[PDB]
Amino acid sequence: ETGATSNATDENMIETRCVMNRNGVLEATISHFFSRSGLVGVVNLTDGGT
Amino acid sequence: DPVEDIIHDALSSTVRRAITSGQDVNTAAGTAPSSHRLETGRVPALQAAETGATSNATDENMIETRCVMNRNGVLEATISHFFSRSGLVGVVNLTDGGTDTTGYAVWDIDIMGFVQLRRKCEMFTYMRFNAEFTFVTTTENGEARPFMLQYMYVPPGAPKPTGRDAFQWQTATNPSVFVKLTDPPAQVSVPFMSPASAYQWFYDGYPTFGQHPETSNTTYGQCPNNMMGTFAVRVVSRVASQLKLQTRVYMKLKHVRAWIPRPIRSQPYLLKNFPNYDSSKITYSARDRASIKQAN
Amino acid sequence: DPVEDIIHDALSSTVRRAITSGQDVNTAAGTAPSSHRLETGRVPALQAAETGATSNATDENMIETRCVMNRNGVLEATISHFFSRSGLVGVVNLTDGGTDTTGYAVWDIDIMGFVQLRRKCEMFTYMRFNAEFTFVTTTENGEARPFMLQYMYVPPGAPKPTGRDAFQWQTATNPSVFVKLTDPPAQVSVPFMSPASAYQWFYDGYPTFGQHPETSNTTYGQCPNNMMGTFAVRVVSRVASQLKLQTRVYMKLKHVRAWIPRPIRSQPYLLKNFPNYDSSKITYSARDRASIKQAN
Amino acid sequence: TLWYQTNYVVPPETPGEAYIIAMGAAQDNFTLKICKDTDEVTQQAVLQ
Amino acid sequence: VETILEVNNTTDATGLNRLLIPVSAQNKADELCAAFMVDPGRIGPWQSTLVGQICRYYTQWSGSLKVTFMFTGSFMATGKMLIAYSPPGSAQPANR
Amino acid sequence: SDRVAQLTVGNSSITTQEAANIVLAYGEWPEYCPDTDATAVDKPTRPDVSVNRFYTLDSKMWQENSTGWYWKFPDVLNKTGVFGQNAQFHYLYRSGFCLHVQCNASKFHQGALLVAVIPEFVLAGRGSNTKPNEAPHPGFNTTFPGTAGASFNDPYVLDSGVPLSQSLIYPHQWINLRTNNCATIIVPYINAVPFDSAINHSNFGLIVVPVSPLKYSSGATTAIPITVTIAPLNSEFGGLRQAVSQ
Amino acid sequence: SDRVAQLTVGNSSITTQEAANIVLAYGEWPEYCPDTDATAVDKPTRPDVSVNRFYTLDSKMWQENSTGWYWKFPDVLNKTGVFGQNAQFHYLYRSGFCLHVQCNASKFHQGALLVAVIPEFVLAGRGSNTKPNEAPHPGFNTTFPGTAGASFNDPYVLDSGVPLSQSLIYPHQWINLRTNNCATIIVPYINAVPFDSAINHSNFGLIVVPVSPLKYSSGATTAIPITVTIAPLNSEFGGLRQAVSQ
């Protein structure tokens, strides 16, 4: 009800080990999220006799 | 302090020295001169294969040798330069004719379909590498004709195309390659995309829990950390272009790391994912001779 | 270093401070003067028994008291001086008459036979002490007559006597006390002879493994670390001396240490080793009154 | 799974039917890998 | 960011009632109240939250998750619940 | 600030909003058997995360005319989890416990539970037979109830002859439905030997007695359950051999 | 001085008088998963004396025309001892192994066994059906034999297509009835993931093939058994929940 999300992390709830997390987060930035081209519009040019 | 059987081993379970240090070997090993040695108790020829260690009897210890500054090269034996050569992986057949009203082709990414490269990359159990894919695309006769094609990569989870002009081809997020049939082959670079820490070509186990049958155990050995998605191909058009098309895929393995070598397969292959063979026709690795003491 | 979740707790699992330090209290506590305190927020009377802690509201915090250099003594309340008084433990009846052709008496050492001392030494669950045994021996009428007696201690394992003049009475190893009936009572000192670290009068469990019945569970609670052997008594003679004899045993508990106090029994005793009672006649600890608001 | 530890005790003149709102989120060590076309949207023709 | 979870995604539960798991005075103890799989990429409750709709734009996910349970009952009504996350293996438990 | 509380052991956690205190039995924490007190020469095993966690037994419904329940430890945890397996495979067992009993009720219900621990809770046979060969003795299932837990027959004497009034000398705590809703007790290893068996001798027993009976007006919730949860702390096992259930 | 040897793990010991060497597979000892390689956040459990010991499987009688046997690890130890219970209660399992195979024979018998380990010993279906929907696949009991261990059908190809000749690249050792009588191999945790399940994926398999068949003259002892014993070293488990056999 405070509008704030829970801050209960792992160490404060269960007994955890330590892990030197080396996973990457670069592919989650919006730069690399929108850096991929996609279809936008298609036009139809019928240059026939009719 | 109060109880010390728990501290005596905690401060003793550090990294145990397993010294097997290697050295940078640029060229093949030379030799050193050796005279005749008539001595008792020192026998380099007598070995014991039962120790699991290979014989270490070198040349100098057995026969009288000269010295040779061996300058031969060993660089072409490293696995990097062993897998650095591209080979065929998969071929798709896109028959965009009037009778085949599909328009697109789909290929489950699986390099275990062609023996030439499978036999190599299966001599190692765990491999981690980056691939370099190259797509040649011709007609059924081998002709090139100026028709634009679209190759889409469908990772595991994405919706696979359902038609020639379905919406999945918008590739707003999926990587895609647009290239004409009369252009150089399309070449891209793909990283190590497995969720695990290394690809494994042999996974002695099951993917899921539960009861496993004994008649059709079709799920044994199939590791999911290998399946890396799907490859869809179409020709960019609204109506059918009447042509038979054939796309061949070649992959180069660069920045390779291999682990736990494995015997190289002798019996022929029968299935893609499974290492099946037939007990009726066991092809012995050595060709037959007439007699044993008659070396040809 | 390589894995440190194993070191972080090994060097953190030392003796955890559980400070409950006591102090040497020679005499009872005095009191300090106190005036009236008209303050809010500080209430020594309001307690909470639901915390499992007893109230700490002392006198000075509740009513206006004077000061008193209390010189009363507390030494007679220590368990040492509480168990330092000998009491009856067991009585044996040696009828060495012509009709009773046995000649010896045998008593399983068990102080749980007489309520007077059992009720005391059962208010604590684990006790460790040294005993001081004293044997008075009279006739059935209470007379002393110059007949020499032999008390033998038969630890668990030794052969119990089988006759008045059997070989077991040679007491080559067993401790034994020879004393005349017209002499002061025989007194000896016995140490803490249990195999465990403390005597326990309540052992919530079974001695052995196996299937335990539900009809006659005669083996429940009987701890072996309590049974300390046997006490045999005879009159030193080859033929019978026609007399009825009665030996009473008194034990003093010195150098006592008690642990885990226990509620003092209210219902009467019914069995020696078992804490049985009867649900038909439940003797309430408090005598009955006429009304509740009519304190007599 | 969400189990009834003890019960839902309620005094008189109070509704015996309540509700629980479940909310989900990612922790601080959440991370993601290769992009992908979602499968939650479908389109047949252009939006004219 | 916390976002609501369509955990009551059953038929005959149309509307906003999908976001509410019911709670009632149970006459039988040790009873189950609700359950759902913790795979955001899977279809189901997580398909409604934000993490679950944005984890579908990527292929592989890693890291822990959290689930907040807010009680919307009366003030005088009390209770206790047991929230148990069971790692993979057999199906959901039968008893608690 | 003092009503709220969170215990966490192993992979399990317990919250509470109205319980206010943590009764540390006899002012001593559970610890490992120091070398100056050990007698077994072999090396024990200390999982400390597989067994040290909160196991939640079944729930007992508090009725208007209930009589109280008792459990034996570590009898309850002899068939559940890795604790059960370690206790069935090992001969010498040592551990302290952390008890937590919850019984919530609305602010209109009334009642009080006494939650205590009885070291060496020897039960008694209820019968006036005085000869030791015909006297009644409690059956095995009545003295080692198991995970189910057993009920009392006359709690005023705790089924052990001793009165319930003086039972407050034990590590105890009340559950008063007007102030608190759960009681917790951290008890160490209480025994006369460094280690002991886990299937023959039960170190202590848990006691839950409804002193002030449950009372409520009509319309309120009638099903008021009691739930107990136990966490073995600083556990050690030794003397490994084949599995013996009992 | 080098023929005699004694291994000791936990409460168990193994002597040997004629075995001469200890093959350390790939020159690495079994170690715990360092924090720089761990992915699971929870804290694992490390008994190290309840599970780290020498479990002795049943014996297989070497016949004059035997064909060889294979075991899967840790499949064999999934129903025996605290190792079995930990593997049935935990989801993530990690451990190295110490194998020791004994096959003694008089100084008049002759023969040779090849004792090797095959990381990821995927078995194969023996059949010429080339369509993947009718092709034969090995049953569950043929691929996860259990404590009993299974026998080969054609060991020349190791039931996996690959020839037995090159199988010497694996950590191996011979049992030559003229020199040694038992072979031992210390193998670490070989897998592409920090931890893995213990009931789905078997890290490796043990292979015992009678290359030189047993041969003896009349009157000698005909019953020549082979006994294998395994010691899981530096074992860790994680992800605790209810017991799942398979």
Ligand SMILES: CCCCCCCCCCCCC/C=C/[C@H](O)[C@H](N)CO
């Ligand atoms: C638009 C570009 C499309 C081409 C790129 C497709 C992605 C290629 C992913 C390759 C994944 C690693 C190589 C595959 C290995 C094996 O096939 C699998 N482990 C199973 O056989």
Ligand SMILES: CCCCCCCCCCCCC/C=C/[C@H](O)[C@H](N)CO
């Ligand atoms: C020749 C001397 C004979 C008298 C000495 C006999 C030895 C006395 C041993 C006493 C052992 C400790 C006191 C006994 C305690 C309880 O009776 C037992 N724990 C069971 O009731």
